[PDB]
Amino acid sequence: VNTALQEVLKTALIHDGLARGIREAAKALDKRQAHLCVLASNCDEPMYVKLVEALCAEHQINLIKVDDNKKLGEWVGLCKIDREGKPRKVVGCSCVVVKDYGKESQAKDVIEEYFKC
Amino acid sequence: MLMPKKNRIAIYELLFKEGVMVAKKDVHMPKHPELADKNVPNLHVMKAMQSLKSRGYVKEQFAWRHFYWYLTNEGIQYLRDYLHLPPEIVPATLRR
Amino acid sequence: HRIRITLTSRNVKSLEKVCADLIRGAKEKNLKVKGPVRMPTKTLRITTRKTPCGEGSKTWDRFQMRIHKRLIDLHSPSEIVKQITSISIEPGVEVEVTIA
Amino acid sequence: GHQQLYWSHPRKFGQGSRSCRVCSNRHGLIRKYGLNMCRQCFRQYAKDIGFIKLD
Amino acid sequence: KSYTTPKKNKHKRKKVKLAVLKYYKVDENGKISRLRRECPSDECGAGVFMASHFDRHYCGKCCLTYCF
Ligand SMILES: [Zn+2]
């Protein structure tokens, strides 16, 4: 499930369909364009856990969780200078939402049957 | 570089369909004739193109106003990496 | 019903030779034709200053262009005129098919 | 608001809207037949526009 | 290099933390709330939010100001 969701993130980054971030995530929530997102959990968030569970539990959004925040934005490319390898300066993410225009893939049927069952 | 993301994408796709772009060097002209489907000032187009010249993926030529950008094959690789498109489609200039 | 051909030339001897050869074509097809009319040439007047800046005696130059135009009337059907116009072309004369 | 402050001087007439078609200057333009050239660029481009000096 | 006249700056956005969460107040149960206004019109998008001034709300692009 994790590798398939990562390649969905990569293909949506290639297609420029995803809306990386949080304000534009709320924009997609208000436009009702939230189908899959990666939700942070058990992190050191002082007044953010209640609001992030509120925005994840808003309108037909997947219950996809991640262990930590700093490794979610490494795939997104928040400060990913020097594309051939690892950057010398990077800040992690909190939330990413995807709008898979190229939704159809080999593992997408497995992912939706995992979620819907 | 005060330019939107769609403007670079459309300019790069315009450079894919025709390999060399023409432009008139004047800042007092924001109604671009050669790209008329979208409103775009020519000043920011020439700023992005001199940025790409300082990158070093495309040539430079002058005919009294007329900046001619001759693209290289490694420049084709860099631009197709920027759009993240497969190299299956050849340039139309390369099509005989 | 009536047709006409207009021939504007930069040169003069090319104009005379092309018009004479088209008269010879109109006579080898043996058709009653109004002959060419020698329209006047235009004496072009451009006068500039040779000096880039201002110093000394002011010496000018007289620059002239030569343009020579003709009209020839035709009474022949138009397709033969198209066929004789599509052959014997030359770089420098933009031909016309006057219709009225 | 510099998009509407940029065209705060309209260009419709005068020598501010007209310039050379070769070297882009605003002195001594040729308005004969819409050449829109200055004198010296016309002088160095007079040989290749089909010209002989006669009188 | 420098002028004897003083210089006035330009509107630079400073280091601001926890601002957009001010548009989502933490309530008791699962009620989607809103403390400030939005566009009733559509020339500004639904994700565009109003300002909180002394007596009026200002739209991001449309500049349609409605006072109280
Ligand atoms: Zn609005």
Side-chain angles (χ1 to χ4, degrees):
Chain A
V1 54
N2 45 8
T3 304
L5 263 58
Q6 280 293 333
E7 72 94 20
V8 173
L9 292 184
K10 294 311 162 305
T11 49
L13 264 171
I14 292 307
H15 203 283
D16 288 337
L18 60 82
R20 35 203 277 187
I22 194 57
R23 174 261 190 171
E24 58 273 14
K27 285 175 73 71
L29 261 68
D30 193 359
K31 298 293 178 55
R32 279 85 62 100
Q33 297 287 338
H35 288 58
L36 281 75
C37 72
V38 189
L39 168 62
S41 176
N42 61 88
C43 278
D44 295 328
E45 324 175 15
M47 280 184 37
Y48 201 56
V49 295
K50 180 92 76 176
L51 201 57
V52 73
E53 293 291 335
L55 64 88
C56 182
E58 197 260 334
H59 184 261
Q60 60 179 358
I61 317 180
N62 204 328
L63 60 83
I64 289 308
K65 65 177 73 174
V66 65
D67 290 330
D68 202 76
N69 280 86
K70 77 182 180 186
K71 69 186 187 65
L72 185 50
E74 296 283 334
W75 314 104
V76 192
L78 311 187
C79 317
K80 268 218 304 179
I81 317 298
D82 297 330
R83 192 200 71 256
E84 95 287 340
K86 201 79 169 299
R88 75 279 191 191
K89 163 173 46 181
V90 63
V91 176
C93 178
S94 298
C95 292
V96 63
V97 298
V98 288
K99 318 171 185 181
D100 312 331
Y101 290 161
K103 175 191 173 67
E104 306 291 330
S105 296
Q106 182 177 0
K108 198 67 174 187
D109 303 336
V110 176
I111 289 308
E112 64 90 19
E113 197 179 3
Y114 157 82
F115 165 63
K116 200 61 64 180
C117 168
Chain B
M1 191 95 78
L2 202 79
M3 272 186 48
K5 190 69 173 188
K6 296 185 58 186
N7 189 359
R8 301 280 300 275
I9 291 295
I11 284 178
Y12 282 26
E13 273 293 9
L14 204 67
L15 211 66
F16 291 167
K17 53 180 65 61
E18 300 288 336
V20 174
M21 184 177 177
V22 307
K24 296 291 176 276
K25 181 221 169 161
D26 56 345
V27 188
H28 284 91
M29 183 278 288
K31 333 311 181 163
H32 203 271
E34 326 288 342
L35 190 152
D37 43 357
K38 294 208 284 184
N39 302 269
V40 54
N42 200 36
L43 171 70
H44 290 76
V45 176
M46 82 175 58
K47 281 173 188 176
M49 279 300 159
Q50 63 104 220
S51 82
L52 294 174
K53 148 185 162 183
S54 51
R55 306 301 326 195
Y57 292 102
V58 68
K59 298 293 183 182
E60 160 72 25
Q61 217 283 330
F62 195 11
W64 292 352
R65 294 130 185 99
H66 288 60
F67 286 137
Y68 298 149
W69 293 272
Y70 293 91
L71 73 165
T72 64
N73 60 5
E74 60 88 20
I76 294 171
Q77 171 215 355
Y78 156 73
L79 295 184
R80 268 207 281 244
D81 208 336
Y82 197 93
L83 191 65
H84 307 279
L85 212 53
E88 197 267 327
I89 44 172
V90 293
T93 51
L94 296 201
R95 289 156 210 170
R96 187 208 186 281
Chain C
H1 202 207
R2 318 300 265 280
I3 50 166
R4 184 168 49 195
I5 308 296
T6 306
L7 206 68
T8 64
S9 66
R10 171 191 291 183
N11 212 323
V12 55
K13 299 308 290 179
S14 61
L15 178 65
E16 294 284 339
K17 180 180 180 176
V18 163
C19 186
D21 288 326
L22 261 67
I23 288 300
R24 290 293 285 195
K27 202 51 185 184
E28 71 178 0
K29 70 189 68 190
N30 292 82
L31 191 137
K32 169 179 173 298
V33 55
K34 182 182 296 185
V37 172
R38 296 189 167 111
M39 311 265 268
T41 186
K42 315 179 72 58
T43 62
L44 276 297
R45 313 299 202 72
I46 303 105
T47 50
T48 61
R49 275 281 299 279
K50 292 174 166 298
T51 67
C53 189
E55 173 260 349
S57 297
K58 280 88 192 180
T59 81
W60 297 74
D61 48 359
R62 269 72 51 91
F63 280 14
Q64 314 199 259
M65 294 326 168
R66 243 54 176 176
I67 182 67
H68 293 254
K69 72 184 80 66
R70 295 294 176 87
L71 73 165
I72 53 171
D73 270 326
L74 277 296
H75 280 60
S76 63
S78 298
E79 306 190 8
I80 304 106
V81 189
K82 299 285 184 174
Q83 277 176 354
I84 67 170
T85 311
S86 61
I87 201 65
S88 178
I89 67 174
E90 50 191 18
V93 166
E94 286 82 15
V95 303
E96 295 286 340
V97 187
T98 300
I99 61 170
Chain D
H2 290 342
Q3 288 302 321
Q4 43 93 17
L5 260 71
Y6 186 67
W7 282 91
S8 54
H9 175 265
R11 303 287 188 177
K12 188 169 54 189
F13 53 84
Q15 71 282 342
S17 59
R18 224 181 301 110
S19 189
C20 175
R21 288 179 66 189
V22 174
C23 65
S24 176
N25 66 99
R26 284 99 169 275
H27 288 285
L29 277 296
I30 301 315
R31 222 173 301 181
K32 288 311 270 174
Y33 292 164
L35 291 174
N36 281 188
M37 281 155 167
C38 69
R39 50 200 192 283
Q40 315 103 350
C41 70
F42 181 76
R43 172 164 314 280
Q44 286 70 241
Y45 280 78
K47 189 111 172 172
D48 62 358
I49 53 174
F51 153 73
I52 307 178
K53 200 206 262 203
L54 277 297
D55 203 8
Chain E
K1 169 65 63 181
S2 181
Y3 294 165
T4 65
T5 300
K7 184 161 53 179
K8 187 187 299 299
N9 66 274
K10 188 48 70 72
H11 177 75
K12 178 75 172 57
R13 306 287 303 277
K14 264 74 187 177
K15 299 198 301 296
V16 178
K17 180 74 73 171
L18 306 188
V20 291
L21 316 184
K22 293 181 55 56
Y23 280 90
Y24 285 88
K25 193 63 182 298
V26 176
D27 277 329
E28 194 258 341
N29 220 31
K31 201 262 171 190
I32 50 171
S33 297
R34 204 190 60 180
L35 194 149
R36 288 96 172 263
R37 278 297 192 265
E38 294 172 2
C39 285
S41 298
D42 206 5
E43 310 86 307
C44 291
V48 184
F49 297 148
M50 291 325 117
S52 176
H53 275 247
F54 68 102
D55 220 336
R56 55 200 210 159
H57 301 262
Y58 169 63
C59 180
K61 277 74 69 177
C62 309
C63 296
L64 75 175
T65 306
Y66 289 95
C67 297
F68 294 158

